[PDB]
């Protein structure tokens, strides 16, 4: 499944700018048909949206991936709304200490 796979090629500092906290990002994966629910919700979704955080980022031909950067104070509104627009709640961020674990574990399992 393209929703459960632990991505290791799209997470980057350039899209996960983990620094002095001002924002709160989240990955999105929505079927192609529902693309109007998000595209036409470009800025009527709520306040505190980030420019270029809703434009084209990545498309899997079955899901579409972005980096929804909302601020570090109004997370409540989008957190509540995420359960009615079919957002994957997989909280991921640029942290190699977990990215390396899956690859090392898989290779070690194969070798053993």
């Amino acid at each position: 499944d393209l929703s459960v796979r632990s991505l290791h090629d799209i997470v980057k500092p350039e899209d996960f700018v983990l620094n002095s906290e001002h924002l709160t990002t989240v990955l999105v994966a929505v079927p192609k048909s529902l693309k109007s629910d998000f595209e036409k919700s470009y800025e009527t979704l709520s306040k505190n949206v980030v420019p270029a955080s809703a434009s084209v980022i990545a498309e899997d031909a079955e899901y579409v991936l972005f980096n929804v950067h909302l601020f570090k104070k109004n997370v409540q509104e989008f957190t509540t709304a995420a359960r009615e627009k079919k957002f994957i709640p997989r909280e991921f961020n640029y942290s190699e200490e977990l990215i390396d674990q899956l690859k090392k574990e898989h290779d070690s399992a194969a070798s053993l």
């Binding site: 350039e14 700018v17 002095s20 924002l23 955080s53």
Partner: protein
């Protein structure tokens, strides 16, 4: 992107670091001069009693 509404916030939070450092420094200096005044006022009080 990450350079619109963030880099300006990055400079803002660097200014925040500077201002909170200023406030900390004032905390330490106020404490130090508080203790210095406490130690010197008592010294003057003492230099009064020997003359008495």
């Amino acid at each position: 992107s990450q350079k619109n509404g963030i880099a300006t916030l990055l400079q803002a939070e660097k200014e925040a670091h500077e201002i909170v450092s200023k406030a900390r420094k004032y905390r330490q200096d106020k404490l130090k001069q508080a203790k210095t005044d406490a130690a010197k006022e008592i010294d003057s009080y003492k230099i009064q009693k020997d003359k008495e």
